[PDB]
Write an enzyme that holds these catalytic residues in place. Structure first.
Site, mmCIF file in Angstrom:
data_model
loop_
_atom_site.group_PDB
_atom_site.id
_atom_site.type_symbol
_atom_site.label_atom_id
_atom_site.label_comp_id
_atom_site.label_asym_id
_atom_site.label_seq_id
_atom_site.Cartn_x
_atom_site.Cartn_y
_atom_site.Cartn_z
ATOM 1 N N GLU A 168 -12.739 3.628 -15.069
ATOM 2 C CA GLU A 168 -11.614 3.365 -15.968
ATOM 3 C C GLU A 168 -12.113 2.478 -17.112
ATOM 4 O O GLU A 168 -13.014 1.656 -16.919
ATOM 5 C CB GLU A 168 -10.480 2.630 -15.247
ATOM 6 C CG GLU A 168 -9.738 3.437 -14.188
ATOM 7 C CD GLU A 168 -8.775 2.605 -13.358
ATOM 8 O OE1 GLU A 168 -8.508 1.437 -13.713
ATOM 9 O OE2 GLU A 168 -8.277 3.121 -12.335
ATOM 10 N N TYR A 227 -8.274 5.013 -19.363
ATOM 11 C CA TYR A 227 -7.061 4.936 -18.560
ATOM 12 C C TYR A 227 -5.879 4.716 -19.510
ATOM 13 O O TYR A 227 -5.818 3.661 -20.138
ATOM 14 C CB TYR A 227 -7.157 3.785 -17.549
ATOM 15 C CG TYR A 227 -5.976 3.762 -16.614
ATOM 16 C CD1 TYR A 227 -4.810 3.072 -16.946
ATOM 17 C CD2 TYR A 227 -6.003 4.471 -15.413
ATOM 18 C CE1 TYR A 227 -3.709 3.072 -16.102
ATOM 19 C CE2 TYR A 227 -4.909 4.476 -14.562
ATOM 20 C CZ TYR A 227 -3.762 3.779 -14.913
ATOM 21 O OH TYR A 227 -2.670 3.772 -14.071
ATOM 22 N N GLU A 247 -4.997 8.610 -0.735
ATOM 23 C CA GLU A 247 -3.700 8.564 -1.412
ATOM 24 C C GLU A 247 -2.986 7.287 -0.950
ATOM 25 O O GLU A 247 -3.385 6.703 0.061
ATOM 26 C CB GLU A 247 -2.897 9.845 -1.130
ATOM 27 C CG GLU A 247 -2.527 10.094 0.331
ATOM 28 C CD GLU A 247 -1.069 9.815 0.666
ATOM 29 O OE1 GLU A 247 -0.435 8.950 0.013
ATOM 30 O OE2 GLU A 247 -0.555 10.467 1.604
ATOM 31 N N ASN A 290 -11.182 3.301 -3.670
ATOM 32 C CA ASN A 290 -10.886 2.712 -4.976
ATOM 33 C C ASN A 290 -10.441 1.262 -4.795
ATOM 34 O O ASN A 290 -9.354 1.014 -4.279
ATOM 35 C CB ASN A 290 -9.801 3.508 -5.706
ATOM 36 C CG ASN A 290 -9.523 2.959 -7.095
ATOM 37 O OD1 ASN A 290 -10.430 2.858 -7.911
ATOM 38 N ND2 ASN A 290 -8.278 2.583 -7.362
ATOM 39 N N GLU A 291 -11.298 0.322 -5.195
ATOM 40 C CA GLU A 291 -10.979 -1.113 -5.177
ATOM 41 C C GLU A 291 -10.451 -1.562 -3.822
ATOM 42 O O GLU A 291 -9.389 -2.188 -3.741
ATOM 43 C CB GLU A 291 -9.938 -1.447 -6.249
ATOM 44 C CG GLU A 291 -10.303 -0.981 -7.636
ATOM 45 C CD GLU A 291 -9.333 -1.463 -8.690
ATOM 46 O OE1 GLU A 291 -8.223 -1.941 -8.357
ATOM 47 O OE2 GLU A 291 -9.703 -1.363 -9.866
ATOM 48 N N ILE A 339 -7.894 3.378 3.197
ATOM 49 C CA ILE A 339 -8.418 2.230 3.937
ATOM 50 C C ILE A 339 -7.643 1.003 3.455
ATOM 51 O O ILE A 339 -7.700 0.656 2.276
ATOM 52 C CB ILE A 339 -9.937 2.049 3.729
ATOM 53 C CG1 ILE A 339 -10.697 3.246 4.319
ATOM 54 C CG2 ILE A 339 -10.421 0.751 4.376
ATOM 55 C CD1 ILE A 339 -12.114 3.390 3.812
#
Ligand SMILES: OC[C@H]1O[C@@H](O[C@@H]2[C@@H](O)[C@H](O[C@@H]3[C@@H](O)[C@H](n4cc(COCc5cccs5)nn4)O[C@H](CO)[C@H]3O)O[C@H](CO)[C@H]2O)[C@H](O)[C@@H](O)[C@@H]1O
Ligand SMILES: OC[C@H]1O[C@@H](O[C@@H]2[C@@H](O)[C@H](O[C@@H]3[C@@H](O)[C@H](O)O[C@H](CO)[C@H]3O)O[C@H](CO)[C@H]2O)[C@H](O)[C@@H](O)[C@@H]1O
EC number: 2.4.1.-
Length: 429
Positions: free
Chosen positions: A234, A266, A94, A134-135, A99
């Protein structure tokens, strides 16, 4: 009852329905509400039960959810989704517990977040998979964050393995930066630790594009023979509106359906970004937007030719290090050790309760050697306590300075209200 959503399993580089043996293709949409920290729509029946009928009209079988609150119940919404044949891909992180690509760590705080989500959501057969990041790496300046994500994949998989839960797969969602995409894809399947599946946030197809001109053909040729399932986590470039979503015809066509496992548009909610297919009005009702009918029509026409599990059944080198190009070491940080780090809370003389961090680390690390809390994803050097929480790390250094001075008078050498002498340190892991 979850009869209408049998668990999906992975065999080779494809998803399969565990009961029927038919290949599973994702026809999805992102589903995540934000404030005007995170909102958990799957923990609020009045929200999810409002939207599921519209999600059914779109013809989706999968949602991507970026954040849930693991302290709340999700069975009502997950069962309601199951009754419409809908599955969920779920990020473990979240915004406040992720990270950090600017200062990467894989530690007890982030790992406990991941464990909490896993324990909240693994009982549902329609939980398709978890994203461990995520990315995180998103360009050539932060590729050294990727070893921390690979450690997270390893440890989430092992936690799931040692639990009583169904072995829900753990994967990764990446962006589409030209300089890093091929190395990222190889890195997440190299060596002894592998992602279970790989999602790309794919915006190459804008307006009335084509398979050749969009870049879709070159991406498809790049990922042919990739050893794990791959899909668009996405899609939906909004350059031209209303979005025709003609990429959907390409994605589930015969050329791409042999390589890709589908994708997720998305997104559902409009949030002043021109990416929604509905807008929630001031009366909390659903207003359908011009994109909706195009996505609905495109998903309805989509009829991917797959292969069955029976007919389908009938180590890769990590990218080399190059300065300014690829800087992710094959060597990964160790599994965060909650007990070891919890021992610091008991034994350390000087503690700090959760801008301040940068100043305090700068100050304390000029007086004592902070190697034991440093983690370097480029060199693959990870300090003994680099897996502890940020305040545990800070407390260790403050305590080292206290012992270095040796006054032994319970006066911790840092002027701040959050600093305190730990009386448990006196009591003779
Ligand atoms: O780990 C990498 C980073 O993670 C960050 O949190 C993460 C957070 O930023 C991200 O936001 C998502 C956000 O990135 C995503 N989104 C999607 C788009 C569409 O982009 C269109 C394009 C524009 C240009 C090219 S393509 N824009 N935003 O929308 C999701 C649902 O609304 C959001 O959840 O959701 C993650 C999961 O929960 C958190 O892990 C942390 O905040 C950062 O500190 C950390 O560096
Ligand atoms: O450059 C870093 C940036 O890359 C983004 O991905 C890009 C795509 O945005 C781009 O997409 C389209 C073109 O390929 C196509 O020909 O035309 C349309 C406009 O009509 C472009 O938008 O293609 C390149 C090369 O394949 C991609 O790398 C990422 O989404 C983003 O995360 C990243 O920061």
């Amino acid at each position: 009852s979850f009869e209408k959503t049998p668990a999906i399993k992975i065999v080779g580089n494809k998803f399969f329905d565990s009961e029927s043996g038919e290949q599973f293709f994702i026809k999805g949409i992102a589903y995540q509400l934000q404030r005007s920290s995170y909102i958990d729509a799957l923990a609020d029946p009045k929200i999810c039960l409002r939207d599921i009928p519209f999600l059914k009209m779109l013809g989706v079988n999968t949602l991507r959810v970026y954040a849930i609150d693991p302290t709340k119940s999700h069975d009502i919404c997950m069962e309601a989704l199951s009754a419409e044949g809908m599955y969920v891909l779920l990020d473990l992180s979240e915004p406040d517990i992720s990270i950090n690509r600017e200062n990467p760590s894989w530690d007890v705080h982030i790992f406990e977040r991941y464990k909490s989500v896993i324990d909240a959501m693994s009982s549902f057969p329609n939980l398709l998979g978890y994203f461990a990041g995520n990315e995180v790496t998103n360009d050539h300046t932060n590729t050294f964050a990727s070893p921390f994500v690979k450690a997270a994949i390893r440890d989430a998989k092992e936690y799931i393995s040692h639990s009583n839960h169904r072995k829900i797969p753990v994967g990764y969602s990446t962006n589409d930066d030209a300089m890093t995409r091929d190395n990222l894809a190889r890195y997440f399947v190299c060596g002894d630790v592998k992602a279970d599946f790989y999602g790309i946030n794919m915006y190459e197809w804008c307006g009335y594009s084509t398979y050749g001109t969009s870049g879709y053909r070159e991406r498809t040729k790049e990922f042919e023979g990739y050893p794990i399932p791959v899909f668009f986590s996405e899609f939906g470039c909004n350059l031209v509106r209303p979005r025709p979503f003609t990429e959907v015809s390409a994605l589930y066509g015969n050329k791409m359906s042999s390589v890709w496992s589908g994708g997720l548009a998305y997104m559902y909610f409009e949030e002043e970004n021109e990416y929604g297919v509905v807008k929630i009005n001031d009366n909390d009702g659903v207003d359908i937007l011009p994109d909706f009918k195009n996505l609905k029509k495109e998903f309805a026409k989509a009829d991917p030719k797959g292969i069955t599990e029976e007919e389908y059944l009938t180590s890769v080198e990590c990218p080399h290090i190059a300065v300014g190009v690829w800087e992710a070491n094959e060597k990964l940080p160790e599994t965060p050790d909650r007990s070891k780090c919890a021992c610091l809370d008991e034994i350390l003389p000087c503690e700090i309760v959760p801008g301040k961090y940068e100043e305090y680390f700068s100050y304390l690390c000029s007086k004592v050697d902070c190697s034991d809390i440093l983690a370097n994803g480029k060199t693959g050097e990870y300090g003994e306590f680099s897996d502890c929480s940020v305040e545990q790390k800070l407390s260790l250094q403050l305590s080292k300075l206290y012992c270095k001075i040796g006054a032994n008078d319970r006066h911790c050498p840092l002027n701040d209200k959050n600093v305190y002498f730990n009386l448990e340190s006196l009591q003779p892991c």
